[PDB]
From Swiss-Prot, chain B:
Binding of Mg(2+) 2, residues: D227, E228
Designated name of the protein: Anthranilate phosphoribosyltransferase
Record-stated family: Belongs to the anthranilate phosphoribosyltransferase family.
Amino acids binding anthranilate 1: G83, N114
InterPro entries registered for this protein in UniProt: Anthranilate_Pribosyl_Tfrase, Glycosyl_Trfase_fam3, Glycosyl_Trfase_fam3_N_dom, Glycosyl_Trfase_fam3_N_dom_sf, Nuc_phospho_transferase
Organism for this UniProt entry: Mycobacterium tuberculosis (strain ATCC 25618 / H37Rv)
Highest rank taxon of the organism: Bacteria
Binding-site residues, 5-phospho-alpha-D-ribose 1-diphosphate: 83, 86-87, 91, 93-96, 111-119, 123
Keyword Acetylation found: yes
Catalytic activity from the UniProt record: N-(5-phospho-beta-D-ribosyl)anthranilate + diphosphate = 5-phospho-alpha-D-ribose 1-diphosphate + anthranilate
Classification via SUPFAM superfamilies: Nucleoside phosphorylase/phosphoribosyltransferase catalytic domain, Nucleoside phosphorylase/phosphoribosyltransferase N-terminal domain
UniProt key word Oxidoreductase: no
Length: 339, 344
């Protein structure tokens, strides 16, 4: 593979040959690509319709250059809870849902970066996001949730300053979690990429629900139905989900909207403290979706899994388990943590 | 307009808004673009289906930076004769020969182009192997037009480069739409031409741009992929005149041309091309001569369309007569000799 061969193929409106996406991504990650090459390739791969083979290569290479967690520190049953975003932002919902899932006893391992987001809302809550692999492993063990801060794990494409627009590279987070959880609830704002991502997770034998609100939300919505790509036993089933089937009132899109880091942090405290309304509803639904994906690792009938997921999610909040998990998480980071 | 706005629109799978292509091109040409911005924009604009509005903007900017010829030195009836190449297609042999034949028939020809290693279908090397002096200034191209009947604008002389051009070229290493717009950036601005294009989508788009320019042009694409009127099969012609595009299928068998095989038409290096030019101009019959005549006649037809009273079949008949006679009477061979003498 070479850049001319690859860029020529792209300009010809063709998909890449096997291995070409991997080679290009590896050149970038090792510092061997020039700004022009990075930019042309990033823009081209954002314009062209995505494929599972190419995305799998891109994400696989990105993942291979990440620091892993120390051996045997990630519970076999750990889950991710994340949206891709992409004018959609549900960092509010995803953050709250992650804390609820962890409080329900399912280990959560998230990953990401600051917003200028995910990480900023966590810092606004007092969570210490900037930890090395050993200490993230210790948080997972001791608190039941960990956060893999991108700068610390993926050292390893500042051309994004160069060109000032996001690219496909910014949408691969769910496939590049350094802790490699085998289950998850993955929200995606673009239906074409959601289906592709589902195919990658199937190839990895993950138990994941890839979710897209039929209102465009990158989470399970409460305003209408959602599309779910249910990934289990190496295969994908696409279906429709109606939360009214579990007693959830239809909400309005603007009721679910996030804000800045401080606005988000206030809502997290409201919801964890028991405030009821459209936001809590959406949090419980997405937490339940993650718990359903987790259940999928071990077996599980769909409707009963949902009823159990929703029971566990609601209880995590209503028992105060969630509010207290957050307190323990803040407490952990404030300790004198030694290597 | 801004780079983030334009690059974002492109990644969104949208066409650009009016003025945005021109802005971007001019930022590049005035030295206000980072290597990543140049490469992202050029690649994106090569991947997206072209549009006449955008290609018009890009070409108009590029043409605004070109070195013009001196006032009153390009005849009103001058024509271009060019194949764009691209897609592995190279008919520099046919195009070079057709241009000399057209000029020898008495229709002024003004071309621009580069050496083979600096362009998709630059035939400057073939001209040079024939003994023609290719790197002349605007004044001497003007004199060549008047005294020989044909002028050649060497691209590095008439088209300035842009900041980071060398690094971008080296790093991406493939042609972009920046290399495909030659027919619309000819510094002598001839109002007629035969324009061969290897990409039917871009051919149709360029026809639209020429139409809005009030040009009389035959934009052509062989149904075998050739960037010329082919003898292998039918061709699409976008016949442009008085502001409209008449898209038709063309079959040279209607004028008695025998079907050839694509291989029989193949070019080679500059020395192989120069040997073939001498042979064809010396009267050597066969598939190559046929293709040259067909394309020279196409240029003469474009030339005839500068008058609103031109009739298609009679124009073809006359163009085919004039092109054959230019070879047979030795006029083409004589013109080439004179062109060689001129540079000395």
């Amino acid at each position: 593979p070479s850049w001319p061969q690859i860029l020529g193929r792209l300009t010809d409106n063709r998909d890449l040959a096997r291995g070409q996406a991997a080679w290009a991504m590896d050149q970038i990650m090792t510092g061997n690509a020039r700004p022009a090459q990075i930019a042309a390739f990033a823009v081209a791969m954002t314009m062209k319709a995505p494929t599972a083979d190419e995305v799998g290569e891109l994400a696989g290479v990105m993942l291979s250059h990440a620091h892993p967690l120390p051996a045997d520190t990630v519970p076999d049953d750990a889950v991710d809870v994340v949206g891709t975003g992409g004018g959609v932002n549900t960092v509010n919902l995803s953050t709250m849902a992650a804390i609820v899932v962890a409080a329900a006893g399912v280990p959560v391992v998230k990953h990401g970066n600051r917003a200028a987001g995910g990480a900023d809302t966590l810092e606004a809550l007092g969570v210490r996001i900037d930890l090395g692999p050993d200490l993230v492993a210790r948080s997972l063990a001791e608190v039941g949730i960990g956060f893999c801060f991108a700068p610390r794990f993926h050292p390893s494409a500042a051309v994004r300053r160069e060109i000032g627009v996001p690219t496909v590279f910014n949408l691969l987070g769910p496939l590049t979690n350094p802790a490699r959880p085998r289950a998850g609830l993955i929200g995606c704002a673009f239906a074409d990429l959601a289906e592709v991502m589902a195919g990658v997770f199937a190839a990895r034998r993950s138990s994941v629900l890839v979710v897209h609100g039929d209102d465009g939300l990158d989470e399970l919505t409460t305003t209408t139905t959602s599309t779910i790509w249910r990934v289990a036993a190496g295969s994908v089933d696409k279906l429709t989900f109606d939360p009214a089937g579990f007693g959830f009132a239809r909400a309005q899109l603007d009721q679910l909207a996030g804000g800045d880091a401080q606005a988000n942090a206030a809502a997290v405290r409201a919801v964890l403290g028991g405030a009821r309304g459209p936001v809590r509803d959406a949090v419980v639904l997405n937490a339940a979706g993650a718990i359903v994906a987790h259940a999928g690792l071990s077996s599980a009938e769909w409707l009963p899994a949902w009823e159990e997921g929703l029971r566990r999610a609601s209880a995590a909040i209503d028992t105060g388990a969630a509010e207290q998990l957050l307190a323990r998480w803040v407490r952990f980071g404030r300790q004198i943590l030694a290597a």
